[PDB]
Symmetry: D2
Subunit: 473 residues, 4 copies
C-alpha cells in the first residue's frame, strides 16, 4: 500500500457537495488542509499551479521504478558495469529530502541546523560513534553546496536509491578498491563526486532526451493519478478569481498529461458538457525554469499551439484568449493578471523552487502538496503509541542510571522503521528534519493533495497558533 | 530609566552563592536565562566571549549620545549643513533591528517574511494604505542587499536616529527640493543611498579614526557598566572548562576596557588577591573580523603586548601562556583548544556575525546577550494587560461588523508606544519581528546579561519545548 | 579557383627530396614558411598538431556550402521562414576574421585598435560618413564581448555569409519592420543579438548533434584534402623528436578522418609498408577543449579505442603505447613527453585558441596554418601593381588639392575586390587587419600548409628582422 | 647627471619661436617627438594632460630619495627592523618597468612574451642556467596577476630599489632563515608576497596619509622641474582647440603644484601679464581614478575651490567658467567638450592607466611622456658603437665554433651596464622589453617631455613607416 494508492482511492469517489458532508469529511486528517500561517481565502484572487506531482501525481512505485530502470540503462549505455541491470528499485529504502555527501559518498538525514540524524554508506547504516571519524561534530555545513546535494523532489526518489545501490555495488565488487573519497579501478579513479555527477547527469538525460516522457504517455492509467474532482475544484476557483498554470514542463508534454487529467465524459460536474483543459485557465505558462523564474527569469516567448514549437523572438503582446507563454518570470504573471503577491496562492511541490523562493522573493502565498503525506498520516495514527511513549521517556529523562537513554534510541529506531529504512519525511524520533523545518517556515498551507481545498468554503479563514517567545510567557 | 540602569543596579549587588538564594533569584525574569533549544551545560567544555556589549556594556543613552555627537560632527566637517549641530540624540525614537531602505529613505520594521510592520519617513509614520504606493505588496525583498541595510547592533542606535533626523531636516529645509529618491540642492543631487553611505562611512570613521575610543577610556565610569560578579563567573567557568575571548576590537582598546572591567581591590570573591584580566583566559584573540572569522578568516598574527602592535609575519607557533592572537579564524580556536563545535558556548551580541554564523557555519552553541531586554522585560510585565487584551481581540475576531479590526490597530499602537516610537525589539502587536525570528532560530540561550549564567549550577539542563507540526497533533 | 584547389594541386605531387630541389622549391612563395620571430629548429623536440584545417583541410567551397545548407535547414526546422531554403552559399562574400556587431547587426572589418575598415549591413556596404551615426568615432570597444563576436575560423565562413543573408532577407521582407536593433514581426521581436545567437546555436548543433560529420565521412574525397607527403613529413619529425596530436574533435571522427588522410598503398615513401596513422604519434589526445586546455583544462580521461567511448573515471596511469587521452590540459602533454614550452612547436589554425593562448599562457612555439593564404598569395603577386600604386600615392600625399585622397580610396576599393567582397584576410588597402596583427604578434611561423615544413632541413634557423624603436634609429 | 638634469637644462632656455630655429632644434633627438602611428595635428581639437611626471616632473634622484626615506620610515614605524634606517636610495640599480615575482622574491626584466631577460634576487643577478630551477621555461605567465606585479611608474622607482634592499637584508641577516618563498623569524613567517604587500601598502600610505606631499610643497625648487615654456605651449594649444586636465591628484595638491609651475613674472611670453594657471584650461578634473576612469568611472562631483573639499552630492550642471570636477569618467570629458576620441590627444606618463586604456577603451590618441628618455638618448648616441657591434655579431652568427655566442653575451652586458644595473628601459641587448612593446603599440607619440610639441607647427603630420607582413614583401 503506497502513498499513491490512498490518493487514487480517494480520487475514485465523487464529490458530495452538501455543506454538512464537507465539514464532516475534512474532520479526518487525510483530507485536511494543514495550517502554518494564517490565511484568509477571501483575500485570494489568483490560484496558481505547477503540474508535476501537483496536478499530475505519478503513481508509486511504478513511476519511480520506470525512472530507476531508465536511469540505470543510460548509465550502462555510457560504460557502467553490467551488474547495474540486475538492480531493482526498492521503494522501502529512500525517503525524500536526504543529503548526499559527494566527498565521502553517504546519504545523510539532517535537521535544520545541519545535525546528523541518520547516516548510511551504501546500505550500511552508520551508528553515532562511528560517524565521528568523518563528521567530527556530527554536523554538516549546508552552505558547502559543492559537497552536499539535497534531494528535494520525488523525481529524486530513484537516484536516492540508486546512489546507495552504486556505493554498495562498488564497495563489494572485488574489481574495485574502495578508498576514502571513491573507487579505484586499476588506473581509473571514480570519485563519489564524479559518480554522483554521472547519476545526476543521467537522470537529467532520461527526462529531457530519453524515453521517460514517451513511456509515461503510452500508459497514463498506469502512471498518472486521475480524479474527476479536479475539474470541479478548478471551476470553482475560476468562479471567485483567476487560475494560472506555471509549470517547468514543455507544452507538448503538458498538453498530453493535462488532456488525460481532464478526459471524462463530462465537465466539472457529471452531466455537463466536457470542456478542454485550457479553458480552465486564464494564463498557461510553460518552460518556467523555476526558481530563476522568481528572479529575473528568462525571455518571454510564445508557443505555437498547433506545432508545439516556440515562435521566433520575444513576445510583446497582451494576454489574449488561447495564448500560451514559455519562460518569462513571476512578474509576467502578476502584471498580466494584475495581482499583488499576497493575492496569489501558488500551489506546488518543490519546497525550494516552488515554495521558498516565491515566498522569499515575491511575497506569494504558498500551498505545498506533499504526496507521501497520505501514507505517512496513516502510519502516524497507527503508531501514536510509540511516539507518545517517546515523548514520555523524553520527559522522565529530564526529571533525572542512563539505561533510559538506550531505551530512547531503541524506540526511536522502531518508530522510524515503520515509515521506511530512511525514516519519516518529517522527523527521526523527537527531532525534526530540515524538510519539516522548511515546510513550517515557507509553506502557508500544506496537504497530501491540493484537492483537499475542495472541502473548504471559499471564505474560510485558515488559522495558525500565534508564536510566543520564551520570555514572553 | 534606561535598560543600562537596570543592568547597573543588578551589577552593584554582591553574589549570594547559597544554593537556595540562586534558585529563588533566577525565578524572576530579569535574571533568567531563556531557552530556545535544549542545552546540557555538562557538555560545554569551552566558554567563548566577545567584548563590546557583552563583557563591556556601554551605558545608555550616554554612549549612544556620544556616538551621535561625534558622528554629526564628522558629517559637518566633511561639508554637511550647520543645522546638524543643533540635533540631539533622542533615545525614545530608535529601536534596534530596523531596515533602512536606501531607495526611498525609510526606516522599516519587518517580520521574518519581509512584511512591513512600521514605516517611518523621517519622523512621519506612514499608515497602511499610504505605503502601498512605494510598497505595493507591503513587502520587501530581503535578498536585495544593495537597497536594504539591517541595523543589527547597538552601535547602530545613533545612526538609526540620525537617519531620521537627516531625512526630516532636508525634507523641511527650503534650500532642498525633496524628490522620490533623495534631495536636489540646485545642481547637486544627494540620493538617500549616497546619504546613507555618508552616514555609514562617518560612523565607521568615528570608531576607527575618530575620538570615540579615546573619549570612552577617559571616563569609563560614565560609559561602561562595571560588575564585580564578572570575575567570579569567569573564574567558575575556568574551573570546569576553558575560557576564550574572540573580539573584533584591537588589543590596545581591549586592554583598557578589560582592565577597567576587572579593576577591583580583590579577585573573583572579596578578600582574594586581584589577578590581571588576561589570567582569566586560556586564549585571547583580537581583530577577529567576524563573520568572515567563521569562514576562511584572515591570516593569523601575534600581538606585541608591550608595544600593542602586531609582529611582522604569520604566527606558526603553539598556544603558550600570555600569547595574544590577531585575526585568524574560528578553526584557530578549535584546534588550539582541542574542541568540537558543540563543545563551545559562544556568548555574543551580534545576532548575525556572532550567533547565526557560528551556528550555521560551525555548529557552535550560541548565547545571545540582549541588553535592551532588561528594560523590555519590565515594560512587558507592567502592560501584560494590553497584550492579553490583544490576544483576546484576535480570538474573538476569529469567531466572527469589522469595528473590531479598528480596536485591534488602536490597542496595538498603544502597546507599542510603551517601548518606544519604533515599538518593541521583538514584536509589533501580535506580529513578531525578524530579529525575534533570528533569536528563536539561531540563539540556543539568551538573556539580558550573560552574568545570569552565574545563577545556574554548572550541570544544569536548559530545556526547550519540543516542536510539533500541525498534522502531528 | 579556390584556395583549397591550389593546396590539392600541390598535394598531388610526389616529394622530390634532393637537397637542391628543396632549396629551389621553397624559393617560391606558395611553398615558403614565413617568419615573424626567429626560431631554431634544432631546439624543437616535440611537434604538435591539431586536426581540423591543419592535418584535415576541408575542400572549399564544398565544405562551407555543406555547412551552410545544414545550418540553414536547422534554422527552418526550429521555425525560421521557408525563404532561407532558397539561399545559396556565395564564397565571394565572406572573409575570415570579421566582427559581427550584435547590437546593430553589421559585419565589421577592423584593425588591431578597433578602427572600422569595412562595414556591411546585410549586403549593403556602408560608406565613411554614414557609419558615424552608429559608430561616432569609427571605433569599437573590442573588450565589449557581449556585443562583438570575432569570426576567427573557417568553420565561421558559412555563418559569416549566413548572417548577411539573414539581415538582408528580413530587411527587405515586408512581413517584418526593420528597427535599430532588430526586426519586429507584429507581436514578436527578434533582436540582432538573439538572431545571432540562433545562428550560432544552430552551427554548434550541426557540428555536434547534426549530420555534418556523418556527411563528411561518406564522401571524404569531395571534402578532405589528401596528400601522400603528410606521412613522409611526420615520419621525418619523429626521427628528430616527438610528435603529438591535440585536437578538439572526438576519437570516432578523428579516427575516420586520420585513417583517410593516411590511406595509401604504402608508408612514408612509396614502396614502404603502410602503417596505421596512430603509429605516427607518441601521444594522441582528443576532446581537447582549447583554449581552456592551456589553463586548468579538464579532467583527464581514457578512450576505449575499440568502442570509441570514454572509460569511467579519471586516468592516473603512465603514457603507454596505444593509449589515447581525452581532455586534460597542456601540462598533461609537457609532463608525459618531458618537454618545456619552448621545446614544442604547436601547429594549428585557431589564431586565438591554438596560437595566442599557447604562446601567452605556456610559452609554446607556434606555427599557424592559414589555408586561404594559398590563393591570397596568388592574388597578391598578380596585382602587386595596385598595391605599389597605393604605396606611391600614400607617399606623394605626405609630401603635399585633396583630389589625391579620392584616388586613394578608389585604388583601395579595386585592390580589395580582387580578394572578395570583404577584402583580403590581412589588410584593407594600406591598413592592416586585427587578424594580421595577431598573426605577426603570436605566430612564430606561418604558411599556407604545414607541409611546407618538409622543404626545410631539420637544422634550419628561421630568421626574423630585428625590431627597432623610432628613437633607436 | 640624472635624466631630470637634462630636462631642467633645456627648461631654463627661452623659446626661440623663429620658424627656422624650430626646424633646426627638433633635428636633435633630445627635442624630437617620436612617432609610432601616423597622426595629423590639424585633426586634434582637444589637448589633454595628466599632472604627475607630465606637467610636474619631479627632480631625480631627490624625489625618489625622499620617497625612499619616507617609505622606509613607515615600515620601521609598523615594526620592521631598525637596519632599514641605514639603507640609502641608489639611483643606479632600479630601471622602470620591472616585474616583481611575489612567489620567489625576484625582480625580473621581461620581453612582451614573458621571456626572462634579467633576474636579480636581492642584489644578486642570476645567470641563465640557474634561473631554470625556478623558471623551467625561462618564462612567466603575465596573466597570473596575483604573482607578478609590474612596476610601471616613476613612483615605483623607490619600491623597486627597496624590494631588493629588503630581500638582501633578510637574506644575509642571521636572525632570519631564508626559505624558498620568504623568511622565517623563529615562529613568524614573512612570505615574499606579504613583504611585497607591506612595501606596497607603505608607499600608498606615504602618498595619501604621510608627509610626501607636505614635504614636496615646502621645497618645490628642489623637487619640481619648472619651465617658462609651459605657459607658452598651453596658450598656443588653446588658440587651436581645447585644453583639459585629467589628473589623479586632489585639488589642494594640484593647486599648489600648478601654481608653482606657472609662477613667473609674466604670462605665456615675457612681458605679458601673468594669468592664473586655471585660465589655461577649459576643463579641470581631479580625483580621476584612472584606469577605471576610461570605463564606468566614478560618480561625478564638484570641488569647492575655496575650501578644497567636495560639495555634497552628484554634480548635474553644465560646464561653466571656473568649475572644477572630481571623479567622473572619460565620457564626462567628451560630452562636455563635445569631442570624439580621435579628436583628443591625451598626454600622459602611465603606459597602462593613461595610454593603453584610453587607446583601447575609447579610441583616444595618445602621447606618452618618458622622462628617463632624456638621459637614455644620450647614453644611446655615445655607445652606438656597442649596439652596432652587437648587430654585427648577431648577423655573423646567423651566417655560421660557438665562441661567438659568448662574445655576444659579454657585449650585451657591457652595453646594458651603461644605463644602470638593471639595463635600459627599452631593451636588454638586441631583445626589446615589454615596456618598449607597449610604447610602440599603444602610444601614437612619445618624447622625453611634452614640451617638445612646441617645436612642431600646429598643422604638422607626424608620419610612421607602414608595416608589411613577411609574405607581403
Ligand atoms: N531545499 C533546498 N534545496 C536546494 N538548496 C537549498 C535548499 N534550502 C536552502 N538551499 C540553499 O542552500 C544554500 C545554503 O543554505 P544555508 O543554510 O546557508 O541558507 P538557508 O537555507 O537560508 O538557511 P536556513 O534555512 O537555516 O535559514 C542557500 O543558498 C540556500 O538557498
Ligand atoms: N541580521 C542580518 N544582518 C545582515 N545580513 C543578514 C541578516 N540576516 C540575514 N542576512 C543576510 O541577508 C541576505 C538575504 O537574506 P535572505 O532572506 O535572502 O536569507 P536568510 O536570512 O537566510 O533567510 P531566512 O532568515 O528567512 O531563512 C542573506 O545573505 C543573509 O545572510
Ligand atoms: N581572435 C580572438 N577571438 C576571440 N577573443 C579574442 C580574440 N583576440 C582577443 N580576444 C579576447 O577579447 C577580449 C578583449 O580584447 P582586448 O582588446 O580587450 O585584449 P587583447 O586582444 O589582448 O588586446 P590586444 O590584442 O590589442 O593587445 C580579451 O579577453 C581577449 O582575450
Ligand atoms: N603595464 C601593465 N601594468 C599593469 N597591468 C597590465 C599592464 N599591461 C597589461 N596588464 C594587464 O595584465 C593582465 C595580463 O596580461 P596579458 O598578457 O594576459 O594581456 P595583454 O597585456 O593584453 O597581452 P599583450 O600585451 O601581450 O597583448 C591583463 O589584464 C592586462 O590588462
Amino acid at each position: 500500500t503506497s502513498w499513491s494508492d490512498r490518493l487514487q482511492n480517494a480520487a475514485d469517489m465523487p464529490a458530495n457537495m452538501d455543506k454538512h458532508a464537507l465539514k464532516k469529511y475534512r474532520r479526518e486528517a487525510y483530507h485536511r488542509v494543514f495550517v502554518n500561517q494564517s490565511l484568509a481565502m477571501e483575500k485570494i484572487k489568483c490560484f496558481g499551479f505547477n503540474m508535476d506531482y501537483t496536478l499530475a501525481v505519478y503513481k508509486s512505485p511504478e513511476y519511480e521504478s520506470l525512472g530507476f530502470e531508465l536511469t540505470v540503462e543510460r548509465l550502462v549505455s555510457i560504460g557502467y558495469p553490467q551488474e547495474l541491470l540486475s538492480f531493482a528499485y526498492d521503494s522501502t529504502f529512500p525517503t525524500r529530502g536526504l543529503v548526499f555527501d559527494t566527498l565521502y559518498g553517504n546519504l545523510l538525514k539532517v535537521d535544520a541546523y545541519g545535525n546528523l540524524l541518520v547516516c548510511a554508506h551504501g546500505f550500511n547504516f552508520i551508528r553515532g560513534p562511528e560517524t565521528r571519524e568523518q563528521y567530527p561534530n556530527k554536523f554538516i555545513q549546508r552552505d558547502d553546496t559543492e559537497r552536499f546535494y539535497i534531494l528535494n523532489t520525488l523525481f529524486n526518489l530513484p537516484e536516492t536509491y540508486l546512489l546507495a545501490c552504486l556505493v554498495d555495488f562498488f564497495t563489494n565488487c572485488p574489481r574495485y578498491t574502495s578508498c576514502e573519497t571513491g573507487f579505484k579501478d586499476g588506473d581509473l579513479f571514480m570519485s563519489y563526486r564524479s559518480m554522483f555527477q554521472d547519476v545526476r547527469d543521467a537522470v537529467d538525460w532520461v527526462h529531457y532526451k530519453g524515453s521517460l516522457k514517451e513511456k509515461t504517455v503510452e500508459n497514463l492509467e498506469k502512471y498518472v493519478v486521475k480524479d474527476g474532482k479536479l475539474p470541479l475544484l478548478l471551476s470553482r476557483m475560476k468562479e471567485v478569481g483567476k487560475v494560472f498554470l506555471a509549470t517547468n514542463s514543455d507544452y507538448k508534454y503538458t498538453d498530453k498529461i493535462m488532456t488525460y487529467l481532464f478526459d471524462f465524459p463530462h465537465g466539472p460536474k457529471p452531466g455537463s458538457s466536457h470542456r478542454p483543459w485550457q479553458s480552465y485557465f486564464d494564463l498557461i505558462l510553460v518552460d518556467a525554469r523555476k526558481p530563476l523564474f522568481f528572479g529575473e527569469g528568462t525571455v518571454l516567448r510564445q508557443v505555437d499551439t498547433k506545432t508545439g514549437k516556440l515562435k521566433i523572438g520575444t513576445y510583446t503582446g497582451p494576454l489574449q484568449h488561447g495564448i500560451v507563454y514559455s519562460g518569462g518570470s513571476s512578474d509576467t504573471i502578476c502584471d498580466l493578471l494584475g495581482a499583488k503577491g499576497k493575492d496569489i496562492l501558488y500551489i506546488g511541490d518543490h519546497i525550494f523552487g516552488d515554495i521558498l523562493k516565491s515566498k522569499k522573493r515575491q511575497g506569494w502565498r504558498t500551498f505545498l502538496v506533499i504526496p507521501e503525506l497520505a501514507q505517512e498520516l496513516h502510519v502516524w495514527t497507527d503508531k501514536s503509541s510509540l511516539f507518545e511513549e517517546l515523548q514520555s521517556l523524553d520527559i522522565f529523562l529530564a526529571e533525572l542510571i542512563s539505561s533510559i537513554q538506550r531505551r530512547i534510541k531503541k524506540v526511536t529506531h522502531d518508530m522510524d522503521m515503520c515509515y521506511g529504512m530512511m525514516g519519516s519525511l518529517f522527523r527521526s524520533g523527537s527531532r525534526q528534519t530540515l524538510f519539516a523545518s522548511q515546510v513550517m517556515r515557507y509553506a502557508d498551507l500544506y496537504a497530501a493533495s491540493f484537492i483537499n481545498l475542495l472541502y473548504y468554503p471559499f471564505s474560510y479563514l485558515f488559522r495558525a497558533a500565534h508564536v510566543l517567545m520564551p520570555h514572553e510567557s
